[PDB]
Design a protein around this ligand. Structure first.
Ligand SMILES: CCCCCCCCCCCCCCCCCC(=O)OC[C@H](COP(=O)([O-])OCC(O)COP(=O)([O-])OC[C@@H](COC(=O)CCCCCCCCCCCCCCCCC)OC(=O)CCCCCCCCCCCCCCCCC)OC(=O)CCCCCCCCCCCCCCCCC
Ligand SMILES: CCCCCCCCCCCCCCCCCC(=O)OC[C@H](COP(=O)([O-])OCC(O)COP(=O)([O-])OC[C@@H](COC(=O)CCCCCCCCCCCCCCCCC)OC(=O)CCCCCCCCCCCCCCCCC)OC(=O)CCCCCCCCCCCCCCCCC
Ligand SMILES: CCCCCCCCCCCCCCCCCC(=O)OC[C@H](COP(=O)([O-])OCC(O)COP(=O)([O-])OC[C@@H](COC(=O)CCCCCCCCCCCCCCCCC)OC(=O)CCCCCCCCCCCCCCCCC)OC(=O)CCCCCCCCCCCCCCCCC
Ligand SMILES: CCCCCCCCCCCCCCCCCC(=O)OC[C@H](COP(=O)([O-])OCC(O)COP(=O)([O-])OC[C@@H](COC(=O)CCCCCCCCCCCCCCCCC)OC(=O)CCCCCCCCCCCCCCCCC)OC(=O)CCCCCCCCCCCCCCCCC
Ligand code: HAS
Ligand code: HAS
Ligand SMILES: CCCCCCCCCCCCCCCCCC(=O)OC[C@H](COP(=O)(O)OCCN)OC(=O)CCCCCCCCCCCCCCCCC
Ligand SMILES: CCCCCCCCCCCCCCCCCC(=O)OC[C@H](COP(=O)(O)O)OC(=O)CCCCCCCCCCCCCCCCC
Ligand code: CUA
Ligand code: CUA
Ligand SMILES: [Ca+2]
Ligand SMILES: [Cu+2]
Ligand SMILES: [Mn+2]
Lengths: 100, 57, 143, 574, 331, 190
């Protein structure tokens, strides 16, 4: 423990190493929000589709705007959080020069 | 000071602890007879008495 | 237990977000072919499902900040690391079958709703559970 | 890495004797007091298939009655009870128990543990599930017969007013006893994976099967107690004077929402483990590792996460649910299933496929579930569901998905792990006969029911007029249904013969290229599953154990355009 | 959809057994179904092809005869292709959901301005139809016809409470029937006669569903639509009203129950008979003028079949039906 | 060196079980709130809910949280290896739990005394199912404490018995939490 040791010519499977991104909570939370973001895409599609046949005439702008707002906040949150969770991996790749 | 059952294993709290609600020194469940034991033991130390017995023919 | 403590955060946040989205949606969208108004069944289920996954995740994380670098989680561990006692495991026991039968008797009792069957079922059930829990601690025969 | 000195006069351990040599009385009391995960899993599997045959007999009776117009030998009441009990036993007494049986046998071998976390709890789960099964089936001994309200048990039809007779009650208890049996099985599988993994087996070196079982464990723990609460509420309304499910309280839609919140995760609980079983079978017989491993893990977790939001697409014709939201979510849940399909065909891409029996079963499962899910997408859109809902189109859809994901893939799993479970290999010829019979009989039975569903025949219809115009299609369905019934004769004979006189297994992996850890140990395993643990270092312990010369290739060709990271300098010191 | 199917044998195959439909939204649903089936067939063949390729092209004996060796390339990860193949179904279901929303919303919208509204009652095990309101064009009186029966509906409103007092369900009696509409022009379905509702051509029509007993469903396969009928639909938060823009062609069409209600669920058929608009005025004036006359007598007054030609009543004997002649001779 | 600190397997098992039971109570919550949503249209809820006795509810709530406090003192005694402190505090917890059971029982007896039962109204059915299932859980918890006392009376007090006491404490704390939720729902948020 406390440090790894690889000889030249040896390539391991990278997962669950101390530098791995799967081992940290930011990444998984970002996956959750990234999945959530597609709901806003569905919402805006529902709004404009209902508009296409002359329905939802009294609220369709609000539904489209709130769908887009939720989508953009969720997707940017997921992307940023994922990148934060992957920062240790980038530092390790700078450190060692091995990708796996 | 508090009482301690003598079956309790000895340890130094200053560098660890014996068991908590969250963690323990075992992967599975602890021994009902004490993890500090070292089985097996001798025949006479077991306390068992095997019966010789015969029946009529 | 690091990875599994933290991978539970995706499902729980997704369920919570769906719960809030759904509550706002059903309380506002007056679409034809449906009736406006918050529905409590479904919303309660979503929030308490998020609750279940959050309970699991938070307990596992709260525990995992205590434990050491176990060899099963160390990516280059040797088979000699885990040498020792793994733990205590029940070799055999008749009591699972007995208490399954007791629960069956109780269930049949509430089927026909004969009160004596319910009472005898509950008594038999706690008896079998007690015998299960005292199996490896019954005193030696007192001479 | 350490290399040990040689041992003087070393001999490999005595691997256990195969099955069929057991003496008299060698399993009776062992069975009654068992707390071994693997013997217990075998009896799980046998009991589940017993219930499978029992339910399928009722299915054949249904088909025989619908062969021609007019009630030839059943009444309306008997027909209703038949489809109710066929659905209930096939979903709850066959499917979920076979899932937990395969989990109990395989998962400790895959994660490199000796036993499950809670042995007596596992035995309790088995016995309580069988108790629930017998309670559920006891309704037929009633003079008035068993429950008659469909496997969903919609209200107010299940009210005390509208469903008297004790069979209606026995269903409620038989289901509940089954549900807690499932929960007791799940408590183990989470705690086991969390606490008894082998050294060096990090979480992302687990096989895909146990990942699916993990996700299914959390999903099942979410949803079985909700069923128990709803069912106890219904029994409370029935026996006492309760009013919670009264229609004037909104009880009908309350029950529908609560039940289907339970029920759609149940079908995903049946779905994921058999996806995992084929995800283990396909890499072995194509001699290629699993394609997109962590991608498949993310897809499985995505299915688990989406299953909880999809539930109300079973109610598009109720006029109560919000259509666009649930239609969008049940479209989203198609994506990871398609990812899994793409990964399967990808790992098969330019492989060396050998066609032993489990590979035949796996490709058959893929071919069937493709059309099943393709039909499910059509059912997902409300405007098509307004016509399709609760017709024979729905029947054909869910029989495609269930008969594909459960029956085909469970048979694949049986053929795959019969060596590891018995120390003997199944008859190949009988296996192929069984497969072709089941395949042709199935597609004959259920492909034509799409047309009767479209033409206007509703589900659960016991009799129909000669002038309606769909008698010939039912006749074609019935003949191939009897063929489906005949198909299981070679399966039963093959299992019976192979158990007691089958080909003995010598090597640890008769298929040759087993990737997962259970193929490194003996056939059968010893009582505690492992006479020695390999050096676990990837998702293929057994493969890299048995083929060292392949390792330099296996680590190098893994990624398209693989980086130069093999040439990177040394990173530390011992 | 606004775009028609391919037609011909391709359309018949893509249909694939759907009725042609007799309303505008039925046409819309059929078109959407046909194009969705086209896309589904594309996916089905383009993956069955890959499985067949595995069966015939990627076999082990071929590659070993070719000298490929004991093992293949051992590829595991192709991340860009994986992301592309993940993005493809996302876009497919997205663009599908757009048209789904379109067709669904034009189906379900309750703004079709009914000329006729018929209250429908489902009960174990038959249908009862009642004309609720009729526009002045078709009504006998020139002014709009309103069919609610005062005395019989007053009984329904009086049933809500106080049968000397039980009132358990939110202060109302457990046997409340105030949600049912009782009309003076009614057609009552029996085991001896299949009920027939008479409707005109080319008028927006409305259906108002409810259920005396357990939940039922109203399914007309020629509408390509079905809706659940519940007891206390307001209490269930279920939408009990649905409108058809019109019916486009005359004829007799069977309609069934599509919800498991009980023992005689299969016997609960009805017929929907669509008649010339000028004849509907005669029908309603005849039923109004001499209410003692039966539905069959009114249908004779039109000059069409007195009984449901689409489906005849089932034989009600549990032994006579064994030889397959389970059909009653209405006349 | 001493061994690693590994997760307590039985604690993970019981926590997973309590997380499962939370979804059991989710169903009763959903049924109650659907009943309340229906009732608030007619205002009949606002009448039936006036039958209840909130200060008595507060008293039994105080008793149950006192039970929780005593239970956790017993747990501290257990982790110290002191069997007698465990016996003390667990017997006190058993007493308080029995008093809570009697409290709910007397509540039910008085309520049927002055015109609220399962047949009286939808409020009656919802109230009694929601509180009675929790009452059965409290009874099972008292039984669990008594079984723990049997265990530590018969067997020598090893870590295997200490973790058993620790595990039953989790269940009792879950019982207290769900009572707090039920009380806030029924007597306060009403
Ligand atoms: C499922 C259907 C079958 C029924 C359920 C399975 C069997 C349950 C009873 C098992 C009893 C038992 O331990 O038998 C051991 C005994 C063998 O001795 P052993 O395992 O060496 O005994 C070890 C312990 O001494 C054994 O412990 P012990 O010495 O403390 O003895 C306990 C034993 C005897 O009881 C007592 O010690 C207390 C006396 C009152 C008991 C009942 C109270 C209520 O308790 C019972 O018999 C309880 C019966 C529970 C019935 C549950 C409902 C069904 O088993 C048998 O001889 C046959 C068991 C019965 C047949 C089972 C299969 C049927 C098919
Ligand atoms: C009507 C009036 C009849 C009057 C004449 C009969 C008087 C019998 C007095 C009891 C007696 O003889 O006890 C010793 C007699 C035999 O004891 P032993 O063989 O000398 O000692 C070894 C244990 O039996 C080995 O079993 P164990 O004690 O380790 O585990 C079983 C456990 C079973 O304990 C329980 O089922 C109680 C669990 C706690 C429930 C807490 C809430 C209760 C409210 O404890 C007992 O059976 C002893 C306590 C019995 C009373 C429990 C109430 O107990 C039994 O045979 C009881 C077994 C069936 C209990 C059903 C309840
Ligand atoms: C409830 C039972 C309560 C206890 C009753 C009792 O004591 O019965 C003892 C009595 C026989 O006791 P025994 O003499 O010690 O049995 C050992 C055999 O003589 C000699 O040992 P054995 O190896 O023959 O073990 C018995 C059995 C093997 O043991 C069992 O079958 C146990 C089943 C227990 C669950 C209940 C199922 C109903 O094997 C056979 O009988 C031959 C092969 C049977 C398979 C063919 C039928 C398959 C139907 C399902 C379709 C296949 C699905 C795929 C399976 C793939 C598996 C890798 O009856 C039973 O054990 C019945 C079970
Ligand atoms: C309210 C209804 C539920 C009542 C039971 C509450 C369960 C949780 C209680 C807290 C707990 O986990 O205690 C373990 C704790 C620790 O035992 P341990 O032997 O140190 O555990 C490690 C084993 O050696 C590890 O070795 P093992 O795996 O051989 O032993 C496993 C052992 C211990 O397992 C554990 O400690 C972890 C798993 C917890 C239980 C999960 C299964 C619960 C039942 C099925 C699912 C829920 C259905 C509802 O499993 C059990 O004790 C099974 C309990 C079966 C309850 C059956 C309820 C039937 C309801 C019918 C309707 O238990 C005790 O020592 C005290 C007694 C336990 C409760 C007595 C219940 C009184 C009677 C009430 C019956 C209803 C009337
Ligand atoms: C193991 C058991 C089951 C599985 C698996 C299953 C899968 C699905 N089902 Fe289902 N099903 C429904 C929808 C789906 C969907 C969307 C999926 C998904 O798993 C399907 C995804 C699977 C695939 C294999 C996807 C295709 C694969 C690929 C690679 C392409 C990706 C997808 C693309 C590109 C989009 C397609 C593209 C197009 C152009 C169409 C719906 C409603 O949306 C209902 C209720 C209808 C009603 O009115 O009652 C329903 C009804 C049932 C019932 C009713 C029982 C009863 O009523 O009593 C059961 C037991 C059942 C079982 C099962 N079902 N299903
Ligand atoms: C896992 C889930 C399921 C499987 C597998 C399954 C298999 C079949 N099904 Fe099905 N089912 C239908 C036809 C079949 C047929 C012909 C088979 C076949 O797999 C059956 C053949 C297989 C067999 C296996 C039976 C052969 C038995 C033999 C040859 C010998 C028996 C004698 C002995 C002694 C057995 C040996 C015993 C030993 C212990 C060794 C039909 C229509 O043809 C309906 C709708 C009908 C309606 O109107 O509602 C239906 C309804 C349902 C429903 C909805 C129920 C409801 O709406 O309430 C569900 C959930 C379901 C699930 C499942 N079903 N099925
Ligand atoms: C299980 C049996 C539970 C008790 C059933 C019962 O008798 O309930 C009614 C009881 C007395 O009230 P009352 O209904 O007025 O008198 C009987 C009229 N036939 O009084 C009550 O209902 C008191 C509260 C009972 C709470 C339910 C207990 C758990 C039920 C789980 C199912
Ligand atoms: C201290 C203890 C209390 C238990 C129940 C009493 C019965 C009861 O409640 O009845 C009313 C009760 C009526 O219902 P209730 O009033 O609602 O509770 O009876 C029943 O419902 C059960 C009927 C049972 C029928 C039994 C048939 C004969 C069985 C013979 C068994 C012989 C065994 C021989 C064994 C020999 C070897 C030992
Ligand atoms: Cu019906
Ligand atoms: Cu019906
Ligand atoms: Ca027939
Ligand atoms: Cu579903
Ligand atoms: Mn319906």
């Amino acid at each position: 423990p406390e440090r790894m040791h690889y000889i030249k010519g040896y390539v391991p499977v990278a997962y669950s190493s101390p530098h791995s991104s799967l081992e940290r909570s930011a990444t998984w939370l970002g996956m959750g929000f990234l999945l959530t973001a597609l709901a806003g895409v569905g919402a805006v599609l529902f709004a404009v589709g209902a508009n296409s046949v002359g329905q939802q005439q009294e609220h369709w702008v609000l539904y489209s705007i709130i769908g887009v707002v939720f989508a953009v906040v969720c997707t940017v949150l997921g992307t940023v959080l994922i990148i934060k969770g992957r920062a240790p991996y980038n530092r390790y790749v700078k450190e060692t020069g091995r990708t796996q | 000071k508090h009482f301690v059952d003598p079956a309790w294993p000895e340890h130094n709290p200053a560098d660890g602890h014996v068991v908590t609600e969250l963690i323990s020194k075992v992967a599975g469940a602890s021994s009902p007879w004490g993890d500090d034991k070292e089985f097996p033991v001798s025949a006479e130390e077991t306390g068992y008495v095997h019966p010789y017995t015969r029946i009529n023919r | 237990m690091k990875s599994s403590a933290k991978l539970m955060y995706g499902p729980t946040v997704f369920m919570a977000a769906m719960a809030v989205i759904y509550i706002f949606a059903t309380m506002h969208v007056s679409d034809g072919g449906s009736v406006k108004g918050v529905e409590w069944v479904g919303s309660v289920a979503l929030v308490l499902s998020a609750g279940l996954t959050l309970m699991l995740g938070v307990y596992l994380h709260f525990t995992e900040v205590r434990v050491d670098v176990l060899p099963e989680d160390w990516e280059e561990a040797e088979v000699a690391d885990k040498a020792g006692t793994l733990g205590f495991f029940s070799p055999s026991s008749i009591w699972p079958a007995a208490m399954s039968g007791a629960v069956g008797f109780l269930a049949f009792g509430v089927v026909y709703f004969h009160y004596w069957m319910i009472a005898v079922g509950l008594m038999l059930l706690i008896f079998t559970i007690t015998k299960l829990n005292l199996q490896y601690g019954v005193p030696k025969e007192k001479h | 890495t350490a290399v040990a000195p040689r041992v003087d006069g070393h001999v490999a351990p005595q691997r256990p004797e195969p099955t069929g040599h057991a003496r008299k009385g060698s399993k009776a009391w062992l069975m009654m007091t068992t707390t071994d995960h693997k013997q217990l899993g075998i009896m799980y599997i046998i009991m589940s298939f017993s219930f499978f045959f029992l339910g399928g007999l009722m299915a054949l009776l249904i088909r025989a009655e619908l062969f021609t117009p007019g009630l030839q030998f059943l009444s309306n009441e008997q027909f209703n009870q038949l489809f109710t009990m066929h659905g209930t036993v096939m979903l709850l007494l066959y499917g979920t128990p076979i899932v937990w049986g395969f989990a109990n046998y395989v998962l400790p071998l895959q994660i490199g543990a000796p036993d499950v976390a809670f042995p007596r709890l596992n035995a309790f789960g088995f016995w309580i599930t069988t108790v629930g099964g017998v309670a559920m089936l006891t309704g037929f001994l009633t003079p008035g017969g068993a429950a008659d309200f469909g496997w969903t048990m919609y209200s107010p039809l299940s009210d005390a007013i509208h469903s008297p007779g004790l069979g209606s009650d026995m269903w409620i208890v038989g289901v509940g006893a089954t549900g807690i049996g499932s929960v007791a099985s799940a408590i183990n599988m989470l705690t086991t994976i969390l606490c008894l993994r082998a050294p060096g087996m990090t979480m992302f070196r687990m096989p895909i099967f146990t990942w699916n079982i993990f996700v299914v464990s959390v999903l099942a723990l979410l949803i079985f107690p909700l069923l128990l609460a709803a069912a106890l509420g219904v029994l409370y309304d029935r026996k006492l004077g309760g009013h919670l499910y009264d229609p004037a309280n909104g009880g009908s839609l309350l029950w529908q929402h609560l039940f289907w919140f339970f029920g759609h995760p149940e079908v995903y609980v049946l779905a994921l483990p058999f996806f995992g079983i084929v995800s283990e079978i396909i890499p072995v017989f194509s001699r290629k590792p699993m394609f997109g491993y962590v991608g498949l893990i993310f897809a499985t977790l995505s299915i688990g996460a989406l299953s909880m939001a999809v539930w109300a697409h079973h109610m598009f014709v109720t006029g109560a649910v919000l259509l666009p939201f649930f239609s969008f979510m049940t479209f989203l849940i198609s994506v990871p299933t398609g990812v899994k399909f793409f990964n399967w065909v990808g790992t098969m891409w330019k492989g060396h496929i050998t066609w032993e029996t489990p590979m035949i079963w796996s490709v058959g499962f893929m071919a069937t579930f493709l059309f099943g899910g393709l039909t499910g997408i059509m059912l997902a859109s409300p405007p098509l569901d307004f016509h399709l809902a609760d017709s024979y189109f729905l029947i054909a859809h869910f029989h495609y998905t269930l008969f594909g994901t459960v029956v085909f893939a469970s048979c694949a799993g049986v053929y795959f792990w019969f060596p590891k479970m018995t120390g003997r290999m199944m008859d190949e010829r009988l296996g192929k006969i069984h497969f072709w019979l089941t395949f042709v009989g199935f597609h004959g039975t259920f492909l034509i029911q799409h047309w009767v569903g479209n033409m206007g025949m509703p589900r659960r219809y016991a009799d129909y007029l000669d002038s309606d115009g769909f008698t010939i299609y039912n006749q074609i369905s019935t003949v191939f249904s009897f063929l489906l019934g005949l198909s299981v004769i070679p399966f039963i004979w093959n299992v019976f013969k192979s158990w007691r006189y089958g080909e003995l297994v010598t090597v640890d992996d008769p298929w040759g290229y087993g990737n997962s850890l259970e193929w490194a140990t003996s056939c059968p395993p010893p009582r505690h599953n492992f006479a020695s643990l390999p050096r676990i270092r990837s998702e293929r312990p057994a493969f890299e154990l048995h083929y060292p010369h392949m390792i330099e290739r296996m680590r190098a060709e893994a990624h398209t355009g693989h980086h130069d990271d093999i040439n990177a300098p040394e990173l530390g010191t011992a | 959809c606004e775009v028609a199917p391919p037609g011909g044998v391709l359309g018949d195959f893509l249909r694939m057994g759907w009725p042609d439909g007799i309303t505008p939204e039925a046409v819309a649903m059929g078109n959407f179904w046909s194009w969705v089936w086209v896309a589904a067939w594309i996916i089905g063949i383009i993956m069955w092809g890959l499985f067949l390729t595995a069966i015939f092209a990627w076999g082990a004996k071929r590659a070993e005869k070719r000298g490929e060796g004991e093992f293949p390339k051992q590829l595991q990860y192709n991340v860009p292709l994986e992301l592309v193949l993940t993005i493809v179904p996302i876009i497919i279901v997205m663009v599908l959901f757009f048209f789904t929303v379109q067709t669904q919303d034009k189906v379900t919208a309750l703004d079709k301005n009914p000329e006729v509204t018929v209250d429908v009652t489902a009960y174990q095990w038959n249908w009862k139809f009642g004309y609720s309101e009729i526009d002045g064009s078709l009504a006998p009186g020139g002014q709009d016809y309103q069919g609610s029966d005062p005395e019989r509906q007053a009984a329904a409103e009086a049933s809500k409470k106080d049968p000397s007092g039980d009132n358990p369900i939110h202060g109302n009696s457990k046997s409340d029937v105030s949600y049912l509409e009782f009309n003076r022009i009614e057609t009552l379905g029996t085991t001896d006669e299949i009920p027939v509702m008479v409707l005109p051509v080319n008028t927006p029509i409305e259906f108002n569903l409810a259920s005396a007993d357990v939940a039922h469903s109203f399914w007309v396969p020629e509408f390509l639509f079905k809706r659940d009928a519940y007891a206390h639909p307001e209490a269930n938060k279920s939408q009990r009203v649905f409108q058809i823009e019109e019916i486009t062609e005359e004829g007799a069409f069977v309609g069934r129950c599509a919800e498991m209600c009980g023992t005689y669920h299969a016997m609960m058929n009805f017929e929907l008979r669509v008649v010339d608009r000028d004849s509907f005025a005669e029908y309603i004036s005849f039923r109004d003028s001499n209410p003692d006359a039966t539905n069959a007598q009114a249908l004779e007054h039109i000059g069409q079949a007195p009984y449901a030609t689409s489906t005849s009543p089932f034989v009600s004997d549990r032994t006579a039906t064994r030889d397959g002649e389970n059909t009653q001779s209405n006349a | 060196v001493a061994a690693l600190n590994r997760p307590n397997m039985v604690s993970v098992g019981t926590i997973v079980f309590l997380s499962q039971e939370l979804m059991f109570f989710a169903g009763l919550f959903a049924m109650y709130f659907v009943s309340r949503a229906n009732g608030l249209a007619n205002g009949s809820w606002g009448e039936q809910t006036d039958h209840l006795n909130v200060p008595y509810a507060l008293l039994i709530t105080v008793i149950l949280v006192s039970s929780s406090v005593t239970c956790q003192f017993g747990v501290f005694a257990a982790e110290r290896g002191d069997v007698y402190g465990l016996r003390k505090w667990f017997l006190v917890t058993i007493i308080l739990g029995s008093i809570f059971v009697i409290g709910q029982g007397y509540e039910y007896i008085t309520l049927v005394g002055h015109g609220l039962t399962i047949q009286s109204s939808v409020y009656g059915s919802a109230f009694f199912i929601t509180t009675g299932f929790h009452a059965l859980h409290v009874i099972a918890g008292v039984m669990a404490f008594v079984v723990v006392l049997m265990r530590i009376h018969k067997s020598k007090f090893t870590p295997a018995q200490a973790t058993a006491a620790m595990v039953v404490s989790y269940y009792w704390h879950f019982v207290d939490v769900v009572w707090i939720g039920l009380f806030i729902t029924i007597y306060f948020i009403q």
